[PDB]
From a paper:
Ataxia-telangiectasia mutated (ATM) is a large protein kinase with a central role in the cellular response to DNA double-strand breaks (DSBs) and related genotoxic stress. ATM, which belongs to the phosphatidylinositol 3-kinase-like protein kinase (PIKK) family, is essential for the sensing of DSBs during the cell cycle. MRN contributes to the localization of ATM to DSBs, and together with double-stranded DNA (dsDNA), it activates ATM as a protein kinase.
As the Nbs1 C-terminal half is unstructured or loosely folded, we made cryo-EM grids using a 28-residue peptide (207 μM) that encompasses the acidic region and FxF/Y motif of human Nbs1 (residues 727–754, hereafter referred to as Nc28) and human ATM (1.2 μM). After focused refinements of the ATM Spiral domain, we built a 10-residue Nbs1 segment (740ADDLFRYNPY749) into the improved density guided by the unambiguous density of the side chains for Phe744 and Tyr746. The Nbs1 peptide adopts an overall extended conformation except for one turn of a 310 helix in the middle (residues Asp742 to Arg745). It binds to a hydrophobic groove between two helical repeats formed by helices sα39 to sα42 (denoted ‘s’ for Spiral domain helices). Phe744 inserts deepest into the hydrophobic groove and makes van der Waals contacts to the side chains of Ser978, Arg981, Cys987, Val1021, Ala1024, Phe1025, Leu1028, and Tyr1034 of ATM. Of the two acidic residues that precede the Leu743-Phe744 pair, Asp741 hydrogen bonds with Ser978 and Arg981, while Asp742 is solvent exposed and uninvolved in ATM contacts. Tyr746 is the last Nbs1 residue that contacts ATM. Its side chain, which is stabilized by intramolecular stacking with Pro748, packs with side chain and backbone groups of Gly1016, Gln1017, and Thr1020 of ATM. The ATM structural elements at the Nbs1 binding site, including the hydrophobic pocket and adjacent cleft, are nearly identical in both the apo and Nc28-bound structures, indicating that Nc28 binding does not induce any noticeable structural rearrangements to this region. Additionally, no significant changes to the structure of the kinase domain were observed when comparing the unbound and Nc28-bound states. F744A and FRY to AAA mutations appeared to disrupt the interaction almost completely, whereas Y746A showed an intermediate effect. These results indicate that Nbs1 Phe744 is central to ATM binding, Tyr746 clearly contributes, while Arg745 makes at most a minor contribution in our assay.
Numbering used by the authors:
A (entry chain A): 1862 to 1876, 1899 to 1974, 1984 to 2112, 2121 to 2392
B (entry chain A): 1463 to 1728
C (entry chain A): 2526 to 2573, 2591 to 2974, 3001 to 3056
D (entry chain C): 1995 to 2112, 2121 to 2126
E (entry chain C): 2260 to 2392
Write the structure that this text describes.
């Protein structure tokens, strides 16, 4: 039985392809035999050798069958068995074991471990196996993409030409997109189209993604991004039947694609869930777009969006960014087309709040280009009035986060100077902005040592407390938070 | 055994039928429905708890036939009313009617849905967690995704306007994320989607599953390995026997009992 | 800090007593045992020093009387329960030293008579704090079982069972002739560290926490703590004599007794001889801990989850213990849960780098021996462990001011005896001005929470690398006390 | 408000003309938020990623200098093939080319070793 | 080297790629591989640079037999750089750092007797300074 089963597994790995069902049946046989106690009691490690098997080949076959945890366990068992066999023979690091496995079996342990860990999707485990071929450009590019180092990824993608062309342009487009760089991406796509008429489907999908994200409505097995572009175009053209049909088709395709695969890891579900959330949000906003638009409906929609964003607090940035981008596109479309009765002021306020939230979220994940783009979009629709707003403070925070302290300090000082004369304890929101700006300026000046403590107390830290307290804008929840923060800063 | 065999034979006869119906086909269908109604009435009258294991499949088979023809709609409607409305007072059938999928939103099902909602909310209004638990408990019965088509819709309506309780559910499930209810619901929905592939009306089921999964975004579930639901009674019965041969006998007999209700005669 | 000297309208003691009385009024279940511990500081002699102690005792008595003015039943019931605990702890329990199956509690013990205590919650439970004054629907003690087990040790602590109002049993460990206040203080530190770790997204995503248990000191000499059910010491699992993992999996290697004998006989030798003997012992003694998760979780998914949880627990415990200078981390002071595969640290008497003052000083920041690394998988300390350590150290560095504040509050506690003394040093290692010290400990802690190691500023990754390379260094491991069991 | 000339802008222009680097940090009190001043500061400190992002973001800047700065930033970051494809796309989207763009095109052609392109400028 | 001096990290990578286009890694290592390791170190990617330098040292341990003076200078410089990097990153205990890298570089520079040169004196000075530090 041992020789015949080993022959079956090495024939599976020979490739002489075999059906997946036979491989799964033999894997089930091995898994069942793993859990049975042998007549000679021994230990649990002894129970894994009812047959004289080579567990590296079994692990490779299981990985081919998308049994990632089983493949990992079998690789561990094979490594342990090899170590004990060597210890018997004499009477080693991962690299030596990998070389021995490659020169006897043809499979290197390090590459199999890396593939299994990539399939599982646990981030930290990707750092455990890097002994061999870590200099290879594709591994370096994957590492750069994992850590969201888009500049290095772009440089390496452009430098290396031995990489296949399709994935090269895919990575270049992804890196350009993740750095902002929308107009550069559009011109690059136009040049790529000029230099080659033939286009692979992934490039077409990326082209549609860029088209719908950049708001260029002239482009006319449908992919997800093509469906999104068609739905947005139909929404602009007020053709609701095609809009709903496209959304339904995209939803069905996403669900079918997810359900075809064999699922073992939760990390394989997140992109599909994000896409389905985006589709659902677009469909929900469709009905609001169709009929008359009122302030209450927009406020309710924004409230539900904020609630679900709060629900998505611990999610990764790669799963939260597309939803925010679709929300921004939806708000811009609703502003530019449907509004003709001066109701666009409320939509402008909602869009400004959404962009401020997007800037905050992007700063939380150490991203400095998306906040700048959001601030530019805010400045496009909003003009600096006599009184300052929250988005100017957000811009100052963004500049501080970009390690440009002098410019942020200048912005905040100008804002405080304007507020000193503009406000007369009239607007509670303006008062909260004023006290928050005073506190932030005091903290920044204390951190940078650009002012002596006396001026810091007299002008900023005590002034914020005085403004928060004496103005008597009581009976609120935001005021209590601002007062707490000012008190804590002064106490510190 | 005889009751189960007769019920499943009639269910298999009904479930397969030509799209074009002649006089003889209509007569055969009417005869099958009359036999099923008579068997159900006799079983429920002679024994109260006889149909608690076959009620869900019978109802799921009878529901699609309501809006396919007018002549036979009367008979299936009367059978459904007798099964649900007439026997609402029976205590043995009360619990199994509690675990039934909601009827489709149509005028013909007005009284049936009124009675079903009255039975379901006897204790009181449900919270989001209770609704999800009810959906999961119902899901263990049938293997046809089509019967779930209405229920999924209701689930969506609960997920859209109860996110405040969803936050509390996520907060409560933080101690042991492995047994979290949201990841369990997502896995159940994915399995139901898998079972609907290559079946009649799969597109509507996929669309409903997609809407339900869109109501719950990429929430961090604090888990990595997906664990599939298992039968606790099966595990206890396995642990009853200590001999290997006895365990093998139990497994084989369970498989044979399960396959006794297949369509093929061989 | 309670006393009776600075009394008056604006006296410190008056305000402190008023605040303590108010806190006791609002939350009796969180403060009454603490007050009674000071009130009953010397009840062991009654049932069977300086002016500050007398003042504290009298103030505690005043607070107890004030509490009793509103809740007489609760006060009397808790006092009776504490007396029963102390009497049970003071029992000799020397004739049943060999017996392990279980010993019936003598009928004369009052603990066998206490039943249906509706006003007393189980002392060893973690009672959640509610902002409403009313405390309702809480599990309360209603019975005690008639038999008690014995925990292996020199002083023979007693393992008893308490059955509450919900009908489920809880195991408690009654200890006598030891100081349990230090353990409670360190548990408070661990709770504060857990709260700090919970509010960072990076460590909340990875579920990095410190396992904790409840300790209740009853007097200056006895106490009762929560027994961790479903846990086993790593030493008992690894180097047990008839069913240790090393014996079962590697019968041809050196036995644990042989390694211990070899290492004990080389103590009064040179460092090269110690090093060579240690290397020879390590050559014929290979780690077998990786099988712990292999024989308990046959499902690969559950096995992977448990291994990941074990690695994360090890990383978090190592970082937190290094920050607090925890010492005396031998195989019998660390437990592993048989269900979650997570580590629990007990016997936290030695902390704040007081283990380096011992005659055989401890030269490692934490325990990272070969078994601990082998339990992590083929990768070792290169994957999840290093990243989790870096995340925990970033969390500690980002909240340094709060940590200094907490440690400053603790180190000046008059009743916290954390400094090393010759008697404790002699007891710890047996083979078969305060202000300057506190200031120096605070200075060392402040240096630790920054990158200042050996006078140079280090990043989080560099500091983690230095700690890891110090923990696994064979020359460091060969120089420690044989009771620490470096080869294990 | 009396003469029509602001002292800060004149000082900044004089210091830019002189060319001393450190003196460029002394006068930044006013209009330092303006995109062109920020871009000049980024180019002075050789922060090419920030310069590229700001050049792409701001559209109110005149087109010729916008593409000139974009090409310079792409060149200084390496990015030769990306620069070539960007130039080809720019040529596709607009046939009319200003002389500075032609000179940059010749510079990229001779630096990238593409010998098919056939008041002559220095790079030409 | 010039691009690294001015805190530029893309031009050195492009230059290393151009070098690799015309040069293939032979049995013995060269100066450009050490330059690539230095570039990777300058890009704050310490693990990859350390792996490159360790592989290079492993190859040189068997490849060279005190034949080429330039190869000897490369070997001793690589040993010194690896020792300094390991000391900086605290990835090794001092005993191994002395025994394997810092003293080995001095031994290779001195005992091999490739004297009567100017580059050798510079390499010996650098190795002596590293060991003394
Ligand atoms: N909280 C606990 N939960 C479970 N087991 C415990 C707990 N505390 C102690 N033990 C076990 O009881 C054993 C006895 O330890 P202990 O009561 O501390 O006496 P000891 O070994 O002499 N230490 P010490 O009392 O300080 O001299 C330990 O080795 C553990 O196995
Ligand atoms: Mg102990």
């Amino acid at each position: 039985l041992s020789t015949h089963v080993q022959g079956f597994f090495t024939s599976c790995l020979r490739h002489c392809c075999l059906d997946k069902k036979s491989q799964r049946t033999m894997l089930a046989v091995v898994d069942y035999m793993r859990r049975q106690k042998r007549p000679s009691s021994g230990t649990i490690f002894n129970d894994a050798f009812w047959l004289d098997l080579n567990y590296l080949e079994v692990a490779k076959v299981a990985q081919s069958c998308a049994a990632h945890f089983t493949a990992l366990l079998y690789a561990e068992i094979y490594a342990d068995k090899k170590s004990m066999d060597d210890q018997e023979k004499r009477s080693t690091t991962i690299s030596s074991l990998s070389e021995k496995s490659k020169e006897e079996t043809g499979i290197s342990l390090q590459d199999l471990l890396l593939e299994i860990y990539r399939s599982i999707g646990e981030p930290d485990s990707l750092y455990g196996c890097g002994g061999g071929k870590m200099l290879q450009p594709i591994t370096r590019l994957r590492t750069y993409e994992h850590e969201a180092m888009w500049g290095k990824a772009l440089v390496t993608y452009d430098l290396e030409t031995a990489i296949p062309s399709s994935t090269r342009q895919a990575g270049i487009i992804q890196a350009l997109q993740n750095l902002g760089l929308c107009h550069i991406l559009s011109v690059y796509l136009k040049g790529l189209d000029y230099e080659n008429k033939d286009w692979c489907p992934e490039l077409e999908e990326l082209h549609y993604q860029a088209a719908w994200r950049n708001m260029q409505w002239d482009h006319c097995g449908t992919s997800y991004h093509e469906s999104l572009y068609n739905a947005l175009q139909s929404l602009r053209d007020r053709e609701f039947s095609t809009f709903y049909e496209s959304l339904k088709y995209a939803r069905v395709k996403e669900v079918e694609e997810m359900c075809k695969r064999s699922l073992e890891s939760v990390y394989s579900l997140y992109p599909t869930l994000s896409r389905l959330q985006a589709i659902g949000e677009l469909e929900s906003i469709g009905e609001l777009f169709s009929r008359s638009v009122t302030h209450r409906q927009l406020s309710e929609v924004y409230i539900k969006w904020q609630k679900h964003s709060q629900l998505l607090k611990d999610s990764d940035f790669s799963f939260q960014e597309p939803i925010m981008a679709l929300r921004t596109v939806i708000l811009e479309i609703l502003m530019e087309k449907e509004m003709d009765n001066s109701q666009r002021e409320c939509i402008k306020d909602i869009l400004t709040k959404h962009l401020v939230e997007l800037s905050i979220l992007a700063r939380t994940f150490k991203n400095t280009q998306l906040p700048e783009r959001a601030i530019f979009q805010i400045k496009q629709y909003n003009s600096v009035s006599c009184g300052v707003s929250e988005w100017q403070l957000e811009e100052a925070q963004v500049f501080w986060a970009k390690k440009e302290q002098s410019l942020a300090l200048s912005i905040l000082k100008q804002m405080i100077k304007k507020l000193d004369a503009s406000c007369a304890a009239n607007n509670p929101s303006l008062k909260l902005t004023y006290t928050e700006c005073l506190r932030v300026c005091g903290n920044w000046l204390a951190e940078t040592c650009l002012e002596n403590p006396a001026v810091i107390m007299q002008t900023y830290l005590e002034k914020a407390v005085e403004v928060a307290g004496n103005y008597d804008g009581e009976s609120s929840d935001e005021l209590r938070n601002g007062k707490m923060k000012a008190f804590l800063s002064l106490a510190r | 055994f005889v009751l189960r065999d007769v019920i499943y034979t009639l269910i298999h006869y009904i479930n397969q039928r030509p799209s074009c119906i002649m006089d003889v086909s209509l007569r055969s269908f009417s005869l099958c429905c009359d036999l099923l109604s008579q068997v159900c009435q006799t079983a429920v009258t002679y024994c109260k708890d006889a149909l608690e294991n076959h009620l869900h499949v019978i109802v799921g088979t009878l529901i699609p036939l309501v809006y396919e023809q007018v002549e036979v709609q009367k008979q299936v409607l009367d059978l459904l009313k007798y099964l649900v409305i007439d026997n609402k007072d029976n205590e043995n059938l009360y619990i199994t009617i509690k675990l039934l999928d909601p009827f489709p939103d149509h005028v013909v099902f007005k009284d049936l849905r009124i009675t079903q909602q009255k039975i379901k909310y006897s204790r009181g209004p449900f919270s989001l967690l209770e609704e999800i638990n009810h959906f999961l408990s119902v899901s263990v019965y049938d293997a046809l995704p089509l019967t779930r088509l209405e229920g999924l819709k209701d689930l969506r309506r609960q997920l859209e306007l109860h996110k405040d309780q969803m936050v509390d559910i996520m907060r409560a499930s933080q101690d042991n994320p492995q047994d979290g209810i949201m990841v369990k619901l997502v896995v159940n929905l994915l399995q139901l989607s898998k079972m609907a592939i290559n079946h009649t009306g799969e597109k509507e089921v996929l669309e409903a599953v997609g809407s339900c999964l869109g109501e719950v975004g990429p929430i961090d579930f604090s888990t990595i390995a997906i664990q599939h639901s298992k039968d606790a009674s099966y595990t206890k019965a396995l642990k009853l026997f200590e001999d290997k041969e006895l365990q093998w006998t139990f497994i084989m007999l369970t498989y044979l009992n399960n396959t006794l209700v297949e369509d093929c005669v061989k | 800090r309670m006393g009776t000297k600075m009394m008056g309208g604006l006296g410190f003691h008056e305000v402190l007593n008023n605040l303590i009385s108010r806190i006791s009024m609002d939350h009796p279940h969180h403060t009454l045992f603490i007050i009674l511990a000071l009130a009953n500081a010397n009840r062991d002699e009654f049932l069977t020093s300086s002016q500050l102690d007398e003042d504290r005792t009298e103030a505690a008595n005043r607070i107890i009387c004030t509490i009793r003015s509103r809740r007489p039943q609760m006060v009397r019931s808790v006092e009776a329960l504490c007396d029963a605990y102390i009497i049970l702890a003071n029992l000799d329990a020397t004739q049943w030293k060999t017996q392990r199956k279980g010993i019936n509690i003598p009928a004369d013990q009052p603990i066998t008579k206490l039943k249906n205590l509706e006003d007393v919650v189980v002392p060893t439970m973690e009672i959640k704090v509610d902002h409403t004054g009313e405390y309702g629907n809480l599990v309360t003690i209603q019975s005690f079982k008639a038999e008690f087990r014995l925990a292996g040790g020199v002083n023979l602590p007693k393992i008893i069972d308490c059955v509450g109002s919900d009908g489920k049993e809880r195991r408690q460990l009654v200890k006598g002739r030891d100081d349990l206040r230090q353990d409670a203080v360190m548990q408070q530190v661990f709770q504060m560290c857990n709260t700090l770790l919970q509010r960072n997204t990076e460590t909340r995503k990875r579920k990095l926490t410190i396992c904790t248990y409840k300790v209740v000191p009853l007097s200056q000499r006895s106490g009762v703590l929560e027994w961790c059910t479903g846990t086993v010491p790593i030493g008992e699992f690894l180097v047990n004599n008839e069913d240790g993992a090393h014996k079962r999996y590697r019968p041809n290697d050196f036995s644990a007794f042989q390694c211990q004998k070899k290492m004990m006989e080389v103590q009064k030798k040179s460092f090269e001889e110690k090093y060579e003997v240690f290397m020879d012992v390590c050559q014929n003694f290979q780690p077998v801990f990786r099988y712990f998760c292999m024989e308990k979780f046959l499902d690969p998914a559950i096995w992977f989850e448990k291994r990941l949880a074990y690695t994360r627990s090890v990383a978090t415990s190592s970082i937190v213990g290094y920050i607090l200078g925890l010492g005396d981390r031998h195989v019998q002071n660390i437990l592993i849960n048989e269900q979650s595969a997570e580590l629990v640290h007990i016997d936290l008497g030695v902390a704040f780098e007081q283990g380096k003052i011992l005659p055989t000083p401890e030269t490692v920041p934490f325990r990272l021996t070969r078994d601990i690394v082998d339990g992590m998988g083929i990768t070792g300390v290169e994957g999840v462990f290093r990243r989790c350590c870096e995340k925990t150290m970033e969390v500690m560095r980002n909240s340094q001011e709060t940590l200094l504040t907490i440690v400053e509050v603790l180190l000046y506690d008059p009743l916290f005896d954390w400094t090393m003394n010759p008697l404790k040093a002699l007891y710890l290692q047996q083979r078969p001005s305060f202000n300057k010290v506190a200031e120096r400990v605070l200075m060392r802690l402040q240096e630790k929470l920054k990158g200042v190691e050996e006078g140079t500023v280090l990043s989080v990754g560099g500091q983690v690398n230095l700690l890891i390379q110090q923990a696994i260094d064979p020359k460091n491991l060969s120089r420690l006390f044989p009771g620490w069991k470096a080869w294990v």
